[PDB]
Amino acid sequence: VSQPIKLLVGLANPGPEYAKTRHNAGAWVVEELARIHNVTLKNEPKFFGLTGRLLINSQELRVLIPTTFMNLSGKAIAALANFYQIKPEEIMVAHDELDLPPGVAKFKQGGGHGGHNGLKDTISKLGNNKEFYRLRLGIGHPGHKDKVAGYVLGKAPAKEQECLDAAVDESVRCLEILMKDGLTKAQNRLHTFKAE
Q1: 71 is in an annotated binding site
Q2: Known catalytic residue at 23
Q3: Are the C-beta atoms of residues 122 and 131 closer than 8 Å to each other?
Q4: Of 133, 95, 129, whose CA–CA distance to 115 is shortest?
Q5: What CATH number is attached to the domain comprising 72?
Q6: CA dihedral 13, 17, 21, 26 (to 10 degrees)
Q7: Under a CB-based contact definition with an 8 Å cutoff, are residues 190 and 136 in contact?
Q8: Measuring CA to CA, which residue among 91, 118, 121 is closest to residue 107?
Q9: Considering 23, 95, 141, 191, which one is annotated as catalytic?
Q10: What residues make up the domain containing 100?
Q11: Per-position DSSP letters for 142-188, written without gaps between them
Q12: How many distinct structural domains can be found in the chain?
């Protein structure tokens, strides 16, 4: 039974050249979960995004990858959330997280956007409501304010990308545990993980 998530959003910038930039880490999670569960994501221009529905341990989970600019991610999330009557507190938003290193991922309930343009827009489009969950996929931090945007929009080197892909995999396993055992159990597992 209880688990509050009805919608998982993986934040992204659109189109083939952005697919493997760090800023798309949330989208990697959603695509992998969707793949393992045999769901083909469908483009729905009415929701400014790619959508699907998975059944996991008899719970319906909607997924969404916006095709907006990252800074307009709330256009998508509010459109789909309004259509399905999903409250902010039932949404989990996967995203790249500067404040964790490659290879680590954490769940979080509420909090600020941290300068993340996607999170920022999401909050505003959901009525200045921060109380959605997050899946924070660590990307490291370049430790110079002026280098942040280029770092986030860049492509990790191969070795670092393996650490990233490992955290994606484990985040997917823990979303599955989320749906079966609940959040405390999912979180207890995810928060001890670090990739090699």
Answers
A1: yes
A2: yes
A3: no
A4: 95
A5: 3.40.50.1470
A6: 40
A7: no
A8: 91
A9: 23
A10: 1-196
A11: -S-GGGHHHHHTS---HHHHHHHHHHHHHHHHHHHHHHHH-HHHHHH
A12: 1
